Amino acid sequence: HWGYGKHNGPEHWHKDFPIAKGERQSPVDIDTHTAKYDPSLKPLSVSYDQATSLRILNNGHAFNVEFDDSQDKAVLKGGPLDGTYRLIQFHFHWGSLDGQGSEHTVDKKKYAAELHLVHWNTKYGDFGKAVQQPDGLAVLGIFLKVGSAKPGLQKVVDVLDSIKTKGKSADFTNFDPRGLLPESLDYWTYPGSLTTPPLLECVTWIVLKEPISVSSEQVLKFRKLNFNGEGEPEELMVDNWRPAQPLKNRQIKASFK
Numbered sequence: 127h128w129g130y131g132k133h134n135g136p137e138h139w140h141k142d143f144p145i146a147k148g149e150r151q152s153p154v155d156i157d158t159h160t161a162k163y164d165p166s167l168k169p170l171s172v173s174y175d176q177a178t179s180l181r182i183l184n185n186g187h188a189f190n191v192e193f194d195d196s197q198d199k200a201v202l203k204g205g206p207l208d209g210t211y212r213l214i215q216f217h218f219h220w221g222s223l224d225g226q227g228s229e230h231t232v233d234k235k236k237y238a239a240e241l242h243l244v245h246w247n248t249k250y251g252d253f254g255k256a257v258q259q260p261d262g263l264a265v266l267g268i269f270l271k272v273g274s275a276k277p278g279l280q281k282v283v284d285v286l287d288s289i290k291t292k293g294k295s296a297d298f299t300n301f302d303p304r305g306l307l308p309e310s311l312d313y314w315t316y317p318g319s320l321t322t323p324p325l326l327e328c329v330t331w332i333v334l335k336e337p338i339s340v341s342s343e344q345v346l347k348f349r350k351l352n353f354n355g356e357g358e359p360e361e362l363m364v365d366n367w368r369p370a371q372p373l374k375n376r377q378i379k380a381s382f383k
């Protein structure tokens with residue numbers, strides 16, 4: 127099955143998932159000089175005051191912080207979006223070293239990591255139906271750089287020891303994702319895809335310009351996770367990022383001057 131190795135990594139995904147070579151794949155390089163300011167874009171509305179996290183999961187590809195999405199509790203609206211999108215999970219992508227890890231790039235710059243907050247359009251009723259629609263998901267992407275620690279991340283880092291290997295989960299209630307957001311909500315937006323199989327072309331991407339800072343210690347704890355299951359040969363969970371894909375016939379729009 128798919129993964130991030132030599133034999134099963136991004137460059138192989140197209141054989142099981144031919145949409146890998148589609149017209150609206152993610153991530154992409156954001157060329158800041160060609161992304162045009164669009165005065166018609168709105169401020170993003172991120173309303174996470176009632177978010178109810180429940181659990182953290184090592185799925186063998188990353189870890190997922192999961193939310194109760196059975197009511198309108200943590201929603202993304204505005205920005206480029208029409209309608210209301212409910213938070214279902216967040217996860218990250220990161221590198222073996224601080225010089226790579228992000229999926230999106232900015233003028234070819236790779237960040238140490240990238241956070242993805244995944245939301246589904248309530249007009250489709252559930253996540254599985256939403257992913258079948260071109261406007262089914264909105265993913266908020268946030269870059270991570272290594273410097274100062276992010277106090278709001280530390281709760282996540284400290285639970286990772288309990289989900290070292292694939293298929294482990296742990297109760298993870300009361301975690302507030304507002305602690306992961308940067309000061310500015312300036313963003314770039316474009317139409318794209320999931321970045322893991324099945325690579326469905328169902329996402330409005332909203333990538334924040336301002337990175338968050340995390341400490342080397344924090345990211346080092348991400349790199350102690352394992353792709354393998356309990357008691358199998360250890361292969362560290364690192365470099366779980368898809369590289370930039372062809373932009374094709376897309377425009378990247380900026381919310382800011």
Ligand SMILES: O=C(O)Cc1cccc([N+](=O)[O-])c1
Pocket residue numbers: 242244265319320321322323324
């Ligand atoms: O389980 C999976 O890898 C598919 C999946 C599910 C939810 C979000 C995703 N994304 O690319 O942001 C991908």
Ligand SMILES: [Zn+2]
Pocket residue numbers: 217218219242321
């Ligand atoms: Zn992701």
